[PDB]
Design a protein around this ligand. Structure first.
Ligand SMILES: [K+]
Ligand SMILES: [K+]
Ligand SMILES: [K+]
Ligand SMILES: [K+]
Ligand SMILES: [Mg+2]
Ligand SMILES: [Mg+2]
Ligand SMILES: [Mg+2]
Ligand SMILES: [Mg+2]
Ligand SMILES: [Mg+2]
Ligand SMILES: [Mg+2]
Ligand SMILES: [Mg+2]
Ligand SMILES: [Mg+2]
Ligand SMILES: [Mg+2]
Ligand SMILES: [Mg+2]
Lengths: 55, 147, 291, 110, 95
RNA sequence: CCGAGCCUGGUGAUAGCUGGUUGUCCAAGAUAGAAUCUUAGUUCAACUUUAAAUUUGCCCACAGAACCCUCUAAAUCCCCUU
RNA sequence: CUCGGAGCAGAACCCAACCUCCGAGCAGUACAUGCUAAGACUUCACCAGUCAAAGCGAACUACUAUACUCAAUUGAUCCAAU
């Protein structure tokens, strides 16, 4: 049960405070995705802020 | 009578006199007398009630002349043979609310015609195939050989 | 006609009614069931052994050991703070018009919470976190009456129906203590207590009563005309001028926000045995019952 | 309870109408309640059995059953199921006919 | 359950039912789904959609919950601007 | 009758375990299963009983329900009519 | 000792043994795996679980795209952290 991947928290850069959790490989740089933000109703950049747990 | 610190005269000293809240201001966009109103049950069992409103468009002089002509083009499908503009509403049980909706439709007609909006609004999806149908009906058109 | 006498002329020939020949109406007394005899004896309906026959069943809700149904469901605040929410018994315009057509509520005098209770129009339960009545719009089309009613809540359409016929509607706040006194005054006059001044509404409810659109009793009287005209334009009715009416003096009549009843200032002690009213003269008491 | 005031036009905005004067010369009579309304009520038991009750019936109550069975049969297409209680002077009918019977009893002036 | 209290001699109410369920005057009981806040990262949007829905209970459950509560919780309330006010009465229901 | 005395009291201790459970007469009435420190028990369902409301239920004609595959099974499901 | 596939159980569903065999307690790709909503299936109860038209909003003029591949690939309530 080696924890290959981890659960992280992606925060929007629009300042809306909207965030979602995604899965990424441990040995990898922090993610910068382009996810949909329902507050502003358009796709916006997200960034990994903090790790939740080890999958 | 009894008076307390929280009396209206003390709270609002610039509003004295009993006949201060019941004075109809004398300083009138839609006159009711110039409108024909009807109430009738709809699909009765259906709960909602219907309130019809009709009035002659041209004879009515409480609307700007250019607006009448602008309204007799846009809402030409709501005009009968005689010339009356009909406005129904059956989205409530109470005749009050149904009449309020019809009256507000008139205030919206006089604003659209006066705003003169010429902005490129979004095209409807149901009207996108008619634009193609009409376009292709013009390239079938022909000119007389000898005009 | 015939049936009434048939049952009394037929009683003339029968024996005298007495304590012997009485019986209950059939179908009103089921037979008692006792654990005796072959049918109902022996095990006596309890079954054979187990916890069933010995009367040691587990509590209600116990499912035999697996996490019960009422415990495996998460908690949600459906009823969080239910004892501190305000309730208002609805009063429909159909009900009000029905009370007026029967004489149970007279429209010639101001209609308040007391007159409605005295006419059995509503039933307020102050101990059940009731704060008054809310005037609802049901029966607005058929409503035809000119009244001066005071209700703690009122909808925008109910106001229009009363202001269309030439009436006046006002919204006032009664605290739980005053609400019990306004509904049942007589039981309060038997306590030998002076009439108390009602309190102001909580901070959250001040906007509602300080607004003219809700016909608030703490609102600016100068803003009512413009608000009365809006409903007329919106709902298509001609705003009548009540100043011309003869009942105008009665419609304007309103009680001081610190007042409970009409013509009875706070501080007085009603004496029902002698039909007299006692008023304090102490300079300090007068200032307490006037502020 | 106060007696209802006299009105110029009947029925009133609420729909109340006073009884006819004199009383109709029928074998039976249905008097008003203490609140001056027709005594026709809806009853229900077991969550599925809908009934209608006519109380405060004086005189021959079997003639009222005949008049009701002759007035409701067209609406149903069949003779309605009723129950008569001579003791209590009550008529009990299967089904909801509250508004239909209140108007029919007003035409007779009860 | 306590059928007869030792001080008042009356039936008591189970407060574990009041913190989880809502009773409509008609007789229906509304609840949440078990697990609508647990491990949302491994569940699908469709499953999460029906997990945060307020659902009804059955006859056997509702009869039990009515026995575990007193008559005070079955009365008709007139709260101001209640989100469930329209659900306290049934419409066009037969049998 | 000391693996821990006797008496009284708390005490009508508790016991999913055993035993017992008192007049007459008629009627309907044998039950897939799931969970459970649970299989000597209980709760839900199923069966069973009573009252009520309503309209279909049982029996069943064609047509119709898979390839991969070893017994090319007895049959079932669905189903108007009757 | 929970979960899944096959046989026993041949053809709708269901079916046991300290019966016979093989497996699971993940991984990978996306980042609209966004919101919402008719109608339905359901491991014989409940709990849980499952499939979904239309619609909003996106994408799109190529991608068998508009409920990802994958068989199981999992853990209620209270409580704690925030
Ligand atoms: K027996
Ligand atoms: K027996
Ligand atoms: K034995
Ligand atoms: K046991
Ligand atoms: Mg025994
Ligand atoms: Mg046993
Ligand atoms: Mg009843
Ligand atoms: Mg014992
Ligand atoms: Mg037998
Ligand atoms: Mg356990
Ligand atoms: Mg067992
Ligand atoms: Mg058949
Ligand atoms: Mg099932
Ligand atoms: Mg779709």
């Amino acid at each position: 049960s080696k924890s290959k991947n981890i659960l992280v928290r992606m925060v929007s850069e629009a300042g809306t405070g909207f965030c979602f959790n995604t899965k990424r490989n441990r040995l990898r740089e922090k993610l910068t995705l382009l996810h949909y933000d329902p507050v502003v109703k358009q796709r916006v950049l997200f960034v990994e802020k903090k790790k939740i747990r080890s999958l | 009578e009894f008076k307390s610190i929280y009396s209206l005269d003390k709270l609002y000293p610039e509003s004295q006199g009993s006949d201060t809240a019941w004075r109809v201001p004398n300083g009138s966009d839609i006159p009711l007398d110039r409108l024909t109103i009807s109430y009738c049950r709809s699909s009765g069992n259906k709960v909602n009630s219907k309130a019809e409103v009709r009035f002659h468009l041209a004879t009515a002089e409480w609307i700007a002349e250019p607006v009448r002509q602008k309204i007799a083009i846009t809402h030409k499908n709501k005009i009968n043979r005689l010339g009356e503009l009909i406005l129904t509403s059956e989205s409530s049980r109470y005749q009050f609310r149904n009449l309020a909706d019809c009256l507000q439709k008139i205030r919206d007609m006089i604003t659209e015609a006066s705003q003169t909006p010429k902005e490129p609004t979004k095209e409807d999806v149901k009207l996108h195939r008619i634009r193609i149908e009409n376009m292709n009906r013009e390239r079938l058109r022909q000119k007389r050989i000898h005009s | 006609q015939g049936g009434g006498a048939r049952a009394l002329d037929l009683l003339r020939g029968l024996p005298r009614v007495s304590l012997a020949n009485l019986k209950p109406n059939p179908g009103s007394k089921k037979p008692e069931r006792r654990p005796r005899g072959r049918r109902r004896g022996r095990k006596c309906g309890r079954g054979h052994k187990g916890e069933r026959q010995r009367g040691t069943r587990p509590r209600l809700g116990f499912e035999g050991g697996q996490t019960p149904f009422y415990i495996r469901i998460p908690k949600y605040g459906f009823n969080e703070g239910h004892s501190f929410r305000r309730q208002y018994k609805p009063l429909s315009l159909n009900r009000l018009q029905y009370l007026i057509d029967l004489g149970r509520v007279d429209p010639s005098q101001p209609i308040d919470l007391t007159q409605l209770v005295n006419g059995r129009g509503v039933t307020i339960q102050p101990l059940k976190r009731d704060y008054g009545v809310q005037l609802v719009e049901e029966g607005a089309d058929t409503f035809t009456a000119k009244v001066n009613i005071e209700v703690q809540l009122a909808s925008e359409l109910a106001i229009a129906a009363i202001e269309k016929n030439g009436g006046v509607v006002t919204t006032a706040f009664y605290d739980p203590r005053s609400l019990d006194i306004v509904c049942k005054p007589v039981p309060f006059f038997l306590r030998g207590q002076p009439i108390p001044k009602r309190m102001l509404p909580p901070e959250e409810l001040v906007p509602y009563y300080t607004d003219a659109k809700n016909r608030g009793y703490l609102a600016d009287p100068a803003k009512f005309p413009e608000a009365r005209l809006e409903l007329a334009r919106k709902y298509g009715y001609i705003l009548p001028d009540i100043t011309k009416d003869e009942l105008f003096k009665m419609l304007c009549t309103r009680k001081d926000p610190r007042q409970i009843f009409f013509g009875l200032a706070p501080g007085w002690v009603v004496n029902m045995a002698d039909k007299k009213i006692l008023k304090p003269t102490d300079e300090n008491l007068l200032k307490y019952y006037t502020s | 309870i106060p007696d209802p005031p006299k009105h110029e036009h009947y029925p009133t905005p609420s729909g109340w109408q006073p009884p006819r004067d004199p009383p109709p010369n029928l074998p039976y009579f249905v008097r008003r309640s203490r609140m001056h309304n027709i005594p026709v009520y809806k009853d229900i038991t077991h969550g599925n059995r809908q009934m209608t009750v006519i109380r405060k019936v004086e005189g021959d109550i079997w003639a009222l059953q005949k008049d009701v069975e002759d007035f409701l049969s067209p609406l149903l297409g069949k003779t309605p199921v009723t129950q008569v209680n001579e003791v209590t002077g009550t008529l009990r009918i299967k089904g909801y006919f509250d508004q239909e019977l209140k108007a029919w009893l007003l035409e007779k002036g009860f | 359950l306590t059928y007869f209290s030792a001080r008042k001699g009356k039936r008591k109410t189970v407060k574990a039912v009041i913190d989880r369920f809502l009773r409509l005057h008609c007789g229906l009981w509304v609840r949440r789904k078990a697990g609508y806040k647990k491990k949302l990262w491994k569940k699908t949007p469709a499953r999460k959609k029906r997990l945060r829905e307020f659902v009804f209970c059955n006859k056997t459950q509702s009869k039990l919950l009515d026995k575990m509560t007193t008559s005070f919780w079955k009365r008709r309330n007139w709260y101001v601007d209640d989100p469930y006010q329209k659900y306290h009465d049934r419409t066009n229901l037969k049998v």
